[PDB]
Amino acid sequence: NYTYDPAEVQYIVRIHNTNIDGTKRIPFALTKIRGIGIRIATAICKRLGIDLRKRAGEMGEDEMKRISDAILDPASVGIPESYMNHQRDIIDGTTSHLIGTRLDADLRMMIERGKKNKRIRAYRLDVGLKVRGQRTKSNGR
C-alpha cells in the first residue's frame, strides 16, 4: 500500500462540541452531530470540495475550519432552501437550520408558549400522549 491508504490517523476529532470518530469516511463521520443526516452532510462535502473518499481523522485545520463554518449556515455554500429543517419561522419569518444544542431549545419553547394560550396539543405533548390520529387502547402501554 504505497498511496492507497494513509500511514497514521487521529482517533478523535472535535467539531461543534461533539467528538467525531476519526476512522470513518468524511460524510458519514459528520452524522454524529445532531442536525446532520447522511443526505445533507454529503451535500455540504460536495459544494465545499472535500474528497468524499478520505477519512475524517486525516484532515488539516484548513478543511475543519471551512466545513465547521459551512455547517452554521448552509445557505451560504449554495444548498436550496427546501433542505433546511426550520423554514419560515412563526416568530420572525426567516429560514434557518438549527443544529445541536439549539434543537432541543426550539421545541421546548414551543411547548411553553402554547400553555399560556391553553392549547390542547401542548398539554398532551407535555405528558407524553400521542398527538397525531392514533388510537390509544391496545398499543402504547
Binding site: 500500500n1 492507497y4 491508504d5 494513509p6 500511514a7 497514521e8 476512522t23
Partner: protein
C-alpha cells in the same frame, strides 16, 4: 391476569472485540509480502484476521501487491475475489 413469565431473563450483549486497524504501516506490509506468495488460495478474509485490519482495507493491500507482486486474481464476483500467489 399478570405478565410474570413473559418477561425475558437475558444478558448484556456478550462481549465485543477491539476495533480493527485502518492504517497500513510499511514494515507490516512487507510482512504480508513475506508469506503470501507461496499460497494456493488467498482471500481478503484470511488477511484481515491474521493482522486485524478492516476487510475493506485488506483488499487494497492485495490489489496493490498484485500489480507488481506475486499474487494474481483468478476469479471475482460481487461477493468474493481470490488471489493465487505466483511462487
Amino acid at each position: 391476569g399478570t405478565r410474570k413469565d413473559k418477561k425475558k431473563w437475558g444478558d448484556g450483549r456478550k462481549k465485543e472485540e477491539v476495533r480493527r486497524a485502518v492504517t497500513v504501516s510499511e514494515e507490516l506490509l512487507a510482512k504480508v509480502r513475506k508469506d503470501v506468495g507461496r499460497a494456493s488460495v488467498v482471500t481478503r478474509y484470511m488477511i484481515g484476521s491474521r493482522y486485524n485490519l478492516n476487510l475493506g482495507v485488506a483488499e487494497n493491500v492485495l490489489r496493490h501487491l498484485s500489480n507488481e507482486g506475486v499474487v494474481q486474481q483468478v476469479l471475482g464476483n460481487r461477493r468474493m475475489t481470490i488471489y493465487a500467489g505466483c511462487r
